[PDB]
Design a protein around this ligand. Structure first.
Ligand SMILES: *[C]C1=C([C])[C]=C2C(=[C]1)N([C][C]([O])[C]([O])[C]([O])[C]OP([O])(=O)OP([O])(=O)O[C][C]1O[C](N3[C]=NC4=C3N=[C]N=C4[N])[C]([O])[C]1[O])C1=NC(=O)[N]C(=O)C1=N2/[C]=[C]/[C][N][C]1[C][C]C2=C1[C]=[C][C]=[C]2
Ligand SMILES: *[C]C1=C([C])[C]=C2C(=[C]1)N([C][C]([O])[C]([O])[C]([O])[C]OP([O])(=O)OP([O])(=O)O[C][C]1O[C](N3[C]=NC4=C3N=[C]N=C4[N])[C]([O])[C]1[O])C1=NC(=O)[N]C(=O)C1=N2/[C]=[C]/[C][N][C]1[C][C]C2=C1[C]=[C][C]=[C]2
Ligand SMILES: CCCCCCCCCCCC[N+](C)(C)CCCS(=O)(=O)O
Ligand SMILES: c1ccc2oc(-c3ncc[nH]3)cc2c1
Ligand SMILES: c1ccc2oc(-c3ncc[nH]3)cc2c1
Lengths: 499, 494
C-alpha cells in the first residue's frame, strides 16, 4: 500500500494532520490502533445519556485552532453552567462563592494566597513557551518537584492545600511526581493560572453540542477509506528509499514520510530500524501520563441550581474521592448530571472498587458538599478509568518528573530522518489539550510540506485568527494584587521598622 | 512452534530461568531480540584487548547465586587490583588513601561524613528487601528525591558532594531524579553502604576470567537451537487455551506459560491481548533505566602501580568526565588498562563528541589525577554507550522516580495470568546486578514449576549456600563510628 504520508494515530492531532495533508493534494493514510478514532476524546451515545464525553471535552477562549477546526466541520459549542454560586469544600464544610478564587479573609493568609498565584505567573513569564529549557533558572527549577516548590513558597497550610489540589487537577499527578520547571511551563503555555482554572473566560468555558468525539469522526468521514481502524503500528523501517510502516494485523504501508501522532511514551510500542538516536530512545521511557477516572452521575433534575449552586465544587480532603466537579446538564436543561474527576493516587486507590461502590461514594460526597439528600438518588452513572488504556497510557496528558525536561525536552519534536512528531505533547500553546493536538498536527503536516518543497520555511509555524464566536477577555490584575507583599516580604518590612 | 515455556529475553535472567526449566525436563524456547545473548552483559574480543567486559562485569562476596551458576558453567574469577593506594581527587588535587573511605580531617566535616553513611544504613534497616513499600515511613521517603534527603542530612558541602558522587555511581542517575525510598532500599538490598562500594570484600572484588558474557553464551551452548536470536517479541495473546507469542520476523510460538525476562519498561514494546491490568499498564511507563558510558583506556604497562597507586580513583567535580575508575589489567599483568564510568548527565553531555575526543579527555584527566605523563599515551580504547540500546534502554538498571515505588512497586513480580516476571529488577538481593538476574530468573522458573504441581509453595524461594571460592567476611564498625554525634547533634549539646 503506497502513499505520500502515513499518519500513525487517529486522535485529534493525527486527524488534523491528515486533513491538512489531504486538502493540499497529498495521498495520506491514517493507521489507528483502536476500532474507533478520537483517542483521548471519546463520546458515548445511549438512550439514558443521549451523548456524553468520557475523555477530553472542554474548550475555551484562546483555543482558536480547535474552535476553527470544529466550526469548519459543522459543530457548535455551548456554555458550561456558571450562573449560580461555586462551592469550596474544605475541612468538612462548604463555603459558597463567586469569582475565580474562594475569598480569603485572614489578612496574613490573604497575603500568602495572593503571592502564591502571582509567583506561579511571575516564574512562568521567565519560561519560553517553545523552549522551557532556556529559562535562566531552568536547571534549578527542573531539579525540584512541585512539592518542594510549594513547601518553600506557601507560608500557610491553607495556601499549600489549595495549590496541591490545583496541581492534582491540572496534570492528574501528585506534587512530588512532577518537575517544578515543567508544571510552571505547562500553566504559562495555557495563558496562566486564571485562564487555566476558570470556567467563564477560561479553559472550561464551553463544550461541543453532541460531544467532542465528532471532531475526529467528521474528519474520518471526509477522508473515507484512508483511515484504517485496528491497525496498531509495530515497526518502522527507514533504511531504504521509502519508509516502511508495519502493522500488527500483518499489513505493510510504504510512504515518503511518517507523522507519529501518539503520546511520546507509546512510541515504545514500535520497533525502529535503524534504532532511535540515544536521546529519543531514553526520552520515551521517561514521560508517563497522569491518572484519572472521569465520572458522570445523572439525576432527575439539576436540583443544586435551586439551592443557588451552579454545580462547580472544589473539594479538598483525603476522604473525598472527587476533588473537582462541574454541572454536566445538557444545554436544553435535561439529562441533569454532575461530572467529577478522581485524581492521581485516588484513581489508583478507588479503581479497586466496583462501579456501584464508586457511585455510592460519589453520591454520599455530593450529598454532604451540596447539603442535599436528593444527591443520594442518582438515575444513571457513566465513568471511564483512562489508566487502563493500552493505547493512551493515562489522561489528560504526559507529565515530566524532576530533571527530565531540561535533559531530554529539546528532542520532543525533533524529526528522526523522515519521521515527524505531532500529538498534543509537542504543542506550544495549550499543550495537553485538544487545542494543542490541532496545533501539533498541523505544524507537523507543514514540516512535511516544507521538506517536499511545497511551502517556504516561515510557513511551518502559523498564527491563528481569534474566534469571533468565543472572544477572549484579557487577564487583568489590581494594583493591590500586584504590590501587596508576600508573607516573608512583610516580615522583612517588620524587621526594617524595628531598627 | 509448540513448547512448555517461552522465555522472552536471553540475558542472564532469561538464560538462568531457561536452564532451570530445561534441567527439570520441560521444553523451553528463549526468544531473544538481538543477534546475540547477554543483554546488559557484553564481552568484546579482539587481539588488542584479548577480551573486555563492556557491560556488567564485577562480582563479589554474598553474590552466591551468580558465583554458583558461573562455576557450574566452568568459569573462574580473579581479583580486581586493590594492592596499592586509592585516590580521592578533589578541587584539582589528589589525596591517596587506604581503606573504604577517603579520610576527612576537619572535625565538623568528619562528624557530617560519618553521620551520612551511618544514617543511610540506619534508614535501610527499616526497609524490607522483599517489600520496600512496607517500610514504616515508605510514603514520606518515597515522596522525596535523594537530592532533598541530602540537602536535609548534609551540613557540609564536602559530605554532600561525596554523597552525590555515591548516588550517581551507584544508580547512574542524578540525586534529584530518584526516590529516597527506592535508593535506600537499593543499597540495603546489596548488604549496605560498605558492602556495595568496596572492592575488597564488596561488590567490586572480582571479575570473570574471559568475561561475564560467557555466562549467557555458555547457557545458550547448552540449550542449542532452543534459543532464537533476532526474535523480538511483539505480541502476546492469553485469550486461548495455550499462550501465543508472536515475533517481529513473523513466527508464532505457543506455550503453557511465559517468563518475561526483560527490563519492566521494555514491556512497552509488546502488544498484549487482553490488555494488561491498569496498574502494570501504567507501571511500565514509569520506570526508566540510568545513563552510562563504560570506557576502557589501554596502556603498555600498569604504570600507576610504580607510584604505589592501585588505579582506583574517586574524582569529584563537574569538569571531570569520569567520576570513578578501577584498574582493568588482566590477572597476568598484561593488557594494562583503566576502566571508567561516565555517569548520568555526563553520559548525555559527552555522547555528542567523537570516540577520539572522549579518549583525549579521559587521558588528560587520568594524567592529572595519577600525576603521570604516561596516561597521555594510550595504546587502545574501547567504550560502550548503553543509552543508545533499543533493547536495554540504558544501564546499569531501572531507577524509580519520586512516588512510584509505593504506588506501583508491588506490581513488578505479580503474575499476569500465565506470564511470570523475571529480570534483575524483580530480585530481592543484589537487584540491579548479575546476581539479581539469577535470583529472579530461577524464582520465576520455580513459580511456573509450582503452578504445574511439580514442587510445593515453599520451594519457590530458595536460599543459596555460600561460595567457598569467594567467602564473605563480616562488615564491622568502630565504637566511634557508631556514637559520634551528627552536626545538629553536636549543636544541640550547645
Ligand atoms: C483522557 C482525558 C480526560 C479524562 C479529560 C480531558 C482530556 C483527556 N483532555 C486531553 C485531550 O483529550 C488530549 O489532549 C487530546 O485528545 C490528545 O489528542 P492527540 O494528541 O491526537 O492524542 P490521542 O488522542 O491520544 O490520539 C492518539 C491515537 O493514537 C492511537 N495509537 C496509539 N498507539 C498506536 C496508535 N495507533 C497506531 N499504532 C500505534 N502503535 C491511539 O488509539 C489514539 O487514537 C482535555 N482536552 C481538552 O481540550 N479539554 C478537556 O476537557 C480535556 N480533559 C480535562 C480537562 C480538565 N479540566 C480541569 C477542570 C478544572 C481545571 C482543569 C484543568 C486545569 C485547571 C483547572
Ligand atoms: C550496562 C551495564 C554497565 C555499563 C555496567 C554494569 C552493569 C550493566 N551491571 C548490570 C547487569 O549487567 C544487569 O543487572 C544484568 O545483566 C541484567 O540481566 P537481565 O535481568 O537478564 O536483563 P538484560 O541483560 O537486559 O536481558 C534482557 C534481554 O532481553 C532482550 N529483549 C528486550 N526486549 C525484548 C528482548 N527479547 C525479545 N523480545 C523483546 N521484545 C534484550 O536484548 C536482552 O538480551 C552490573 N552487574 C553486575 O553484577 N556487575 C557489574 O559490574 C555491573 N555494571 C556496574 C557496576 C558498577 N559498580 C560501581 C563501581 C563502584 C561502585 C559501583 C556501584 C555501586 C557502588 C560502588
Ligand atoms: C529569632 C527569629 C527566628 C525566626 C526565623 C524563622 C525561620 C523561618 C522558617 C519558616 C519556614 C517557612 N517555609 C515556608 C516553610 C519555608 C520558607 C523558605 S525560605 O526561608 O523563604 O527560603
Ligand atoms: C484551586 C483549585 C481548583 C480551582 O478551581 C477554581 C475555579 N473554578 C472555576 C473558577 N475558579 C479555582 C481553583 C483553585
Ligand atoms: C563515594 C563514592 C565512591 C566511592 O568509592 C569508594 C571506595 N571504593 C573502593 C573502596 N572505597 C568509596 C566511595 C565513596
Amino acid at each position: 500500500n503506497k502513499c505520500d504520508v502515513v499518519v500513525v494515530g487517529g486522535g485529534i492531532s493525527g486527524m488534523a494532520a491528515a486533513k491538512l495533508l489531504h486538502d493540499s493534494g497529498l495521498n495520506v493514510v491514517v493507521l489507528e490502533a483502536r476500532d474507533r478514532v478520537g483517542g483521548r476524546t471519546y463520546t458515548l451515545r445511549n438512550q439514558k445519556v443521549k451523548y456524553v464525553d468520557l475523555g477530553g471535552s472542554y474548550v475555551g477562549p484562546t483555543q482558536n485552532r480547535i474552535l476553527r477546526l470544529a466550526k469548519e466541520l459543522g459543530l457548535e459549542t455551548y456554555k458550561v453552567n456558571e450562573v449560580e454560586r461555586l462551592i469550596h469544600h474544605v475541612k468538612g464544610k462548604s463555603y459558597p462563592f463567586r469569582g475565580p478564587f474562594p475569598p480569603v479573609w485572614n489578612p496574613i493568609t490573604y497575603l500568602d494566597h495572593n503571592n502564591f498565584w502571582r509567583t506561579m505567573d511571575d516564574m512562568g513569564r521567565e519560561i519560553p513557551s517553545d523552549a522551557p529549557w532556556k529559562a535562566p533558572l531552568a536547571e534549578e527549577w527542573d531539579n525540584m518537584t512541585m512539592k518542594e516548590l510549594l513547601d518553600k513558597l506557601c507560608w500557610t497550610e491553607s495556601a499549600k492545600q489549595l495549590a496541591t489540589l490545583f496541581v492534582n487537577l491540572c496534570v492528574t499527578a501528585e506534587t512530588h511526581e512532577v518537575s517544578a520547571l515543567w508544571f510552571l511551563w505547562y500553566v504559562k503555555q495555557c495563558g496562566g493560572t486564571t485562564r487555566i482554572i476558570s470556567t467563564t473566560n477560561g479553559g472550561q468555558e464551553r463544550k461541543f453540542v453532541g460531544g467532542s468525539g465528532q471532531v475526529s469522526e467528521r474528519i474520518m468521514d471526509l477522508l473515507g477509506d484512508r483511515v484504517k481502524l485496528e491497525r496498531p503500528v509495530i515497526y518502522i523501517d527507514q533504511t531504504r528509499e521509502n519508509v516502511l510502516v508495519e502493522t500488527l494485523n500483518h499489513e505493510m504501508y510504504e510512504a515518503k514520510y511518517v507523522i507519529s501522532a501518539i503520546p511520546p511514551t507509546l512510541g515504545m510500542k514500535i520497533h525502529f530500524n535503524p534504532p532511535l538516536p540515544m536521546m529519543r530512545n531514553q526520552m520515551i521511557t521517561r514521560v508517563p501520563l497522569g491518572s484519572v477516572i472521569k465520572c458522570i452521575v445523572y439525576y432527575k433534575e439539576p436540583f443544586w441550581r435551586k439551592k443557588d449552586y451552579c454545580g462547580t465544587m472544589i473539594i479538598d480532603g483525603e476522604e473525598a474521592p472527587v476533588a473537582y466537579t462541574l454541572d454536566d446538564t445538557k444545554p436544553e436543561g435535561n439529562y441533569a448530571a454532575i461530572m467529577g474527576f478522581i485524581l492521581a493516587h485516588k484513581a489508583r486507590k478507588l479503581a479497586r472498587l466496583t462501579k456501584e461502590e464508586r457511585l455510592k461514594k460519589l453520591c454520599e460526597l455530593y450529598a454532604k458538599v451540596l447539603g442535599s439528600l436528593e444527591a443520594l438518588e442518582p438515575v444513571h452513572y457513566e465513568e471511564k478509568n483512562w489508566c487502563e488504556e493500552q493505547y493512551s497510557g493515562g489522561c489528560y496528558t504526559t507529565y515530566f518528573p524532576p530533571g527530565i525536561l531540561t535533559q531530554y525536552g529539546r528532542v520532543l519534536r525533533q524529526p528522526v530522518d523522515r519521521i515527524y512528531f505531532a500529538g498534543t505533547e509537542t504543542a506550544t500553546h495549550w499543550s495537553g489539550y485538544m487545542e494543542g493536538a490541532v496545533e501539533a498536527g498541523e505544524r507537523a503536516a507543514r514540516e512535511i510540506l516544507h521538506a517536499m518543497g511545497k511551502i517556504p520555511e516561515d510557513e511551518i509555524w502559523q498564527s491563528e485568527p481569534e474566534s469571533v464566536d468565543v472572544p477572549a477577555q484579557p487577564i487583568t490584575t489590581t494594583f493591590l494584587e500586584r504590590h501587596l507583599p508576600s508573607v516573608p516580604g512583610l516580615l522583612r518590612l517588620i524587621g526594617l521598622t524595628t531598627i
